[PDB]
Every structure is written in structure tokens, then in C-alpha cells.
Amino acid sequence: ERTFQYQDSLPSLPVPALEESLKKYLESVKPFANEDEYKKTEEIVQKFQEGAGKRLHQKLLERARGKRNWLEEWWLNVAYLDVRIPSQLNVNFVGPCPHFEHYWPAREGTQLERGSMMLWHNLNYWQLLRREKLPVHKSGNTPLDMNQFRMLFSTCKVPGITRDSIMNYFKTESEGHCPTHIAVLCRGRAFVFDVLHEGCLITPPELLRQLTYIHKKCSNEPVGPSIAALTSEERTRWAKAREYLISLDPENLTLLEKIQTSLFVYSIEDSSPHATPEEYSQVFEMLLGGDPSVRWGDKSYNLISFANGIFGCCCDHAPYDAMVMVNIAHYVDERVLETEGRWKGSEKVRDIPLPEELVFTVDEKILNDVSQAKAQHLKAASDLQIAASTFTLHPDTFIQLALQLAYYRLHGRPGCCYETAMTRYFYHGRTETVRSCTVEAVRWCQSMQDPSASLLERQQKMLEAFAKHNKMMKDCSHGKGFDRHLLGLLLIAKEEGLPVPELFEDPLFSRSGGGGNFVLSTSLVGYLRVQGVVVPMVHNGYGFFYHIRDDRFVVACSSWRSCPETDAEKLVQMIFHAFHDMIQLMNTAHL
Numbered sequence: 256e257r258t259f260q261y262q263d264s265l266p267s268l269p270v271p272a273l274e275e276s277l278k279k280y281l282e283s284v285k286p287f288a289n290e291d292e293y294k295k296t297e298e299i300v301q302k303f304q305e306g307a308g309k310r311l312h313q314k315l316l317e318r319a320r321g322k323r324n325w326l327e328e329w330w331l332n333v334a335y336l337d338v339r340i341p342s343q344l345n346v347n348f349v350g351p352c353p354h355f356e357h358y359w360p361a362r363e364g365t366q367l368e369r370g371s372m373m374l375w376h377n378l379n380y381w382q383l384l385r386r387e388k389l390p391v392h393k394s395g396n397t398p399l400d401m402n403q404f405r406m407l408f409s410t411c412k413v414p415g416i417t418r419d420s421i422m423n424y425f426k427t428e429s430e431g432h433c434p435t436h437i438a439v440l441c442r443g444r445a446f447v448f449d450v451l452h453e454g455c456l457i458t459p460p461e462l463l464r465q466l467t468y469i470h471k472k473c474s475n476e477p478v479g480p481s482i483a484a485l486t487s488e489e490r491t492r493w494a495k496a497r498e499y500l501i502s503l504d505p506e507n508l509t510l511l512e513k514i515q516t517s518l519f520v521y522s523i524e525d526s527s528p529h530a531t532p533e534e535y536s537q538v539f540e541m542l543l544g545g546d547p548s549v550r551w552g553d554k555s556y557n558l559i560s561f562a563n564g565i566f567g568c569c570c571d572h573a574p575y576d577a578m579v580m581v582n583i584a585h586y587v588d589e590r591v592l593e594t595e596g597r598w599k600g601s602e603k604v605r606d607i608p609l610p611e612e613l614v615f616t617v618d619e620k621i622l623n624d625v626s627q628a629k630a631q632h633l634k635a636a637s638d639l640q641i642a643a644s645t646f647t648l649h650p651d652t653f654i655q656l657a658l659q660l661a662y663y664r665l666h667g668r669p670g671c672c673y674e675t676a677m678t679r680y681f682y683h684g685r686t687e688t689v690r691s692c693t694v695e696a697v698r699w700c701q702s703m704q705d706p707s708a709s710l711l712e713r714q715q716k717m718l719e720a721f722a723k724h725n726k727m728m729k730d731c732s733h734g735k736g737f738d739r740h741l742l743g744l745l746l747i748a749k750e751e752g753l754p755v756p757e758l759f760e761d762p763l764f765s766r767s768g769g770g771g772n773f774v775l776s777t778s779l780v781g782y783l784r785v786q787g788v789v790v791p792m793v794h795n796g797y798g799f800f801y802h803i804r805d806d807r808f809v810v811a812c813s814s815w816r817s818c819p820e821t822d823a824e825k826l827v828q829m830i831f832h833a834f835h836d837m838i839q840l841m842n843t844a845h846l
């Protein structure tokens with residue numbers, strides 16, 4: 256069995272029934288509306304269904320007739336490539352490598368040693384992919400889309416004046432040649448070397464020399480030009496700085512392409528985030544912040560190495576979703592466990608070429624842009640607050656409802672929530688929106704805060720909330736959600752220069768969460784001991800992510816300090832109390 260052999264058999268992403276979608280939409284706005292607003296919205300929705308919507312839906316169906324996935328391109332453009340704000344900090348997702356829970360605790364001086372092995376395992380995974388030996392993901396006996404795995408290596412974003420683009424150079428052995436070099440960023444400089452020698456992958460010892468030549472080459476000297484820092488800028492500025500940097504030297508384009516085509520970017524930091532099984536929130540902060548001088552935000556996969564031998568990943572969210580990064584990070588974690596975090600093979604170091612530096616041609620302007628880029632990224636990042644902890648009836652649904660109660664208790668109002676739902680059952684299926692803030696969830700929350708409420712009432716309502724969410728999560732993953740659907744109708748109109756339907760201008764549309772207005776941006780990152788996070792979706796919002804182990808729940812919450820009403824720390828505390836309260840309500844209501 257080969258990794259991508261089921262791609263041609265995957266079913267097309269479906270288009271829900273118009274009426275079904277609108278009904279789910281109408282139901283979702285209820286928690287945020289009174290009689291009048293609701294009736295107003297209901298009227299708007301009915302006219303839509305009968306008129307414009309029916310026609311835009313018909314056009315959406317025609318689009319699906321010619322595309323195995325009608326959403327693919329639109330989603331990439333409207334959710335990522337078209338956005339102009341700084342993506343590195345505001346869209347990229349990060350995740351700490353959990354190797355410090357066992358064999359690789361935080362410890363100065365282990366940076367180059369562990370790093371050599373980090374590269375070795377990562378590269379073995381790449382080889383696994385290139386040979387299509389990576390196991391096909393399956394739900395029962397149903398194969399899942401594996402296309403996002405093509406975006407892990409040799410993939411990089413390229414800025415545009417109005418729209419960025421994605422460059423995917425990866426290729427399987429069957430498809431042809433694939434870049435075989437990695438790019439290392441250090442002290443504002445960029446080096447690259449071939450990971451192959453005489454046909455086979457270079458061993459850790461050899462990988463150690465390569466990182467040694469680079470580390471020294473710029474360790475006793477001040478930082479370099481830091482062209483990389485420009486990747487953390489507003490998308491248009493970066494696009495302008497790039498065109499310029501190139502106009503100075505036609506060769507600069509060649510260096511940029513070297514970085515873009517590399518299997519991935521390895522960043523060597525000098526900072527040391529406090530990383531321990533108890534406190535690791537700091538790892539998230541330096542992962543999303545850090546020193547822009549050695550980060551290539553446009554890279555789909557940027558492995559980060561700190562001084563205390565701690566590791567983390569920062570990825571461009573545009574080409575793929577977090578599950579691919581979670582998979583390799585976990586694969587490596589397992590490799591570390593089996594080898595007790597050590598290389599026990601040959602110590603020989605064959606005579607392989609030394610890392611070649613990429614010396615960009617710059618002037619006074621570029622250096623100013625570089626200086627500005629660092630300042631804006633660092634300034635913006637300092638406003639970020641991260642709270643990470645471990646807590647020791649589907650687990651995901653349990654956490655989602657607990658978050659609803661927690662937010663409800665902390666802010667005294669229902670929090671419109673976005674929960675990611677994977678739709679990989681379909682060709683190139685990525686995600687769908689699950690709206691956790693349902694009528695059921697709210698009624699349950701109220702009862703939880705209702706002194707006169709009985710235990711039987713509370714559990715009965717909590718259960719109805721679970722049933723509603725489970726169903727919702729199931730339907731959404733099966734392509735029966737409505738968020739992407741409504742987006743498609745809107746995009747059908749826009750693409751033809753037709754006016755924006757009144758449906759989207761409705762105050763309730765955005766109050767319920769539409770238009771990227773969810774106060775709670777969330778997602779389960781899996782069951783593979785790896786955790787990640789991103790910044791909130793709105794200034795007065797929260798970012799809440801988590802992963803589930805058979806013995807604990809691990810969460811990571813983000814919030815903006817500049818916003819006085821939110822506090823990531825207190826929310827995490829609140830959800831833990833919510834977990835507890837929900838526990839008692841289940842054990843007590845045992846009879």
C-alpha cells in the first residue's frame with residue numbers, strides 16, 4: 256500500500272442542500288438574538304432561499320460539477336493568500352516538540368547534539384514520504400485525504416502585492432526529482448547543504464558537523480543582514496521588499512529560491528524558553544515571537560532549535576492544516592523514545608561538502624526594511640499572552656462544552672465559538688466550521704448557573720448539549736456543515752461582480768460568528784502528545800486549542816494584552832473548574 260494511492264478514489268467535496276444549510280444557519284443565530292432580530296433574520300433567509308440564494312446555489316452546484324473540490328482554491332485565497340496582515344505572527348501555527356517530557360529535558364549545551372538527531376529523524380520521515388511508505392490515514396476502512404503531506408517539505412509561500420502564492424516543489428520518487436537540501440538560518444545569515452551523500456541520507460554525526468560549521472562561522476561575529484526578518488511583515492510590504500531585493504541583484508532571486516525549495520528551514524535561536532512538563536507556555540511565546548532574523552515565516556515547515564536544547568515548529572497555515580505537523584512531530588517523538596534520545600550507530604563522519612552560505616546582495620534601503628520588520632513583529636508579538644496547562648461522552652465535545660460554560664461564567668455571555676472540523680473524507684478536503692455555541696449549550700450553561708436548578712435538570716440538559724454537538728461534529732466532518740457553503744454562495748456572487756446578498760450584511764450574521772468574528776477560535780490538535788496554538792481571531796477574542804491523551808487533557812490559550820476584557824490565564828483556570836464541575840454533576844447524578 257502506497258501513501259497517495261487512494262487519492263483518485265476519494266469522493267468529491269459535497270455541496271449541502273440549500274434549505275438544510277439555511278436552517279442550520281437560522282438555528283445558530285438564536286443564542287444571539289431577541290424576537291425581533293430573529294424574525295428579521297428569518298425573513299431575510301426565506302427571501303434568500305426563494306430568490307438570489309437559489310440561483311447562487313445552482314451556480315455553486317455547476318462549479319462542483321467540474322471540481323472534485325469546489326472549495327479548495329477559494330479557501331486558500333480568501334482564508335490565507337489574500338489576507339494582508341502579517342501572517343507569520345497572526346496566522347502561522349506553532350507547536351513545541353514534547354521531547355522534554357522524557358529523554359530531552361531542558362539543558363544548556365545540548366542544542367547541536369539533539370539538533371543533529373532532530374534533523375536525522377525529520378529527514379527519515381521525508382524519505383518515508385518520498386518513497387510513499389508513510390501509512391495511509393484511515394477512518395475504519397475508509398481512506399482519508401493525504402494531499403496535505405505533500406506540503407510538509409520543499410514548500411514555501413511567496414508574497415504578492417495583493418495575493419500571495421504557494422510553491423510546492425515536493426515530489427515522490429514516482430513523480431520525479433525532489434530538492435535534497437535543507438536551509439539553516441543563523442545569526443541573520445542563511446546556509447544550505449545536501450542531506451544526501453553517495454545516495455543515502457547523512458547520519459547524525461555528519462549532521463552535527465554541518466551544524467557546527469555554521470554555528471561557528473557566525474558565532475564570534477555580529478548578526479548578519481537578516482533578510483529573513485522581512486517574512487514577518489505585512490504581506491504587501493514584504494512583497495515590495497522582495498521585488499526590490501531582487502532588482503538589486505538578479506542572483507538574489509536564486510538565493511530566495513534556494514530557501515523556498517529546501518526540504519525545510521532549520522532555525523538556530525540563542526534564547527532559552529523555560530520548558531518543563533509543568534511550565535512550557537514560554538515555549539509557545541518564543542515560538543510565535545522569537546527573533547525574526549532567523550525565521551522564515553513563508554516556509555510551510557520551520558523547525559526551531561533553542562539554546563537549552565528545546566525544540567518547536569512554526570508553520571505557514573496557508574498550504575495545510577496542523578495535523579500534518581502533529582504527525583511528523585509525533586513520529587520524531589517516538590523515534591526519540593525508542594533511541595532513548597541517542598544515536599547508537601556509526602560515529603564515522605564521511606568527507607561531505609561544507610554548508611554553503613547564501614550571501615544576499617543588499618543596500619541601505621533593504622537594511623532599513625529589515626530593521627523595521629523586526630521592530631513591528633517584535634512589538635506586535637509582545638502584546639500576545641499564552642496560557643498552557645495540563646488537566647489530570649466524547650472528550651472533544653466535553654472540552655468544547657466546558658469552554659462554553661467557562662466563557663459564559665467569565666464574561667457572563669455566550670461566546671460564539673469556531674471549532675475546526677476536518678473533512679478529509681473528501682478529495683483535498685481540509686476543514687469545516689463547527690459552531691459550539693448552540694441553543695442547547697446555552698440552556699445548559701444557564702441551568703449550571705441557576706440556583707433553583709435541580710441536578711437532574713443540569714445533567715439532562717448537559718447531555719442534550721453533548722448529543723447536539725456530537726451530531727454537529729459528525730455532519731460537519733461529513734461535509735454537511737453550512738459555513739463553507741454560505742461562503743461559496745457569497746464567492747459565486749463576487750466572482751461574477753454581482754452584489755453581496757443582504758444575508759451577509761445582516762447584523763446577526765457577524766454576531767453569530769460570520770466574517771471571521773468568533774470570540775473563541777478553537778480546535779482539537781489530535782491525540783498525539785503534540786500541542787499547538789495560534790493567536791485569537793479577534794482582538795477581544797481567545798485562541799483555545801488542546802489535545803487529548805488517555806490520561807489527561809492539555810490546553811493552550813491565547814489572548815491579547817492590549818484587550819483589558821480578556822485574560823488567557825483566567826480562562827484556562829475557569830475551564831479546569833468547568834471540567835471539575837462537570838465531573839461532579841456526572842458522578843453525583845449516578846444514583
Ligand SMILES: C[N+](C)(C)C[C@H](O)CC(=O)O
Binds near residue numbers: 576673676685776778
Ligand atoms: C485557527 N482556526 C481554528 C480558526 C482555524 C483552524 O486552525 C483551521 C481551519 O479551521 O481551517
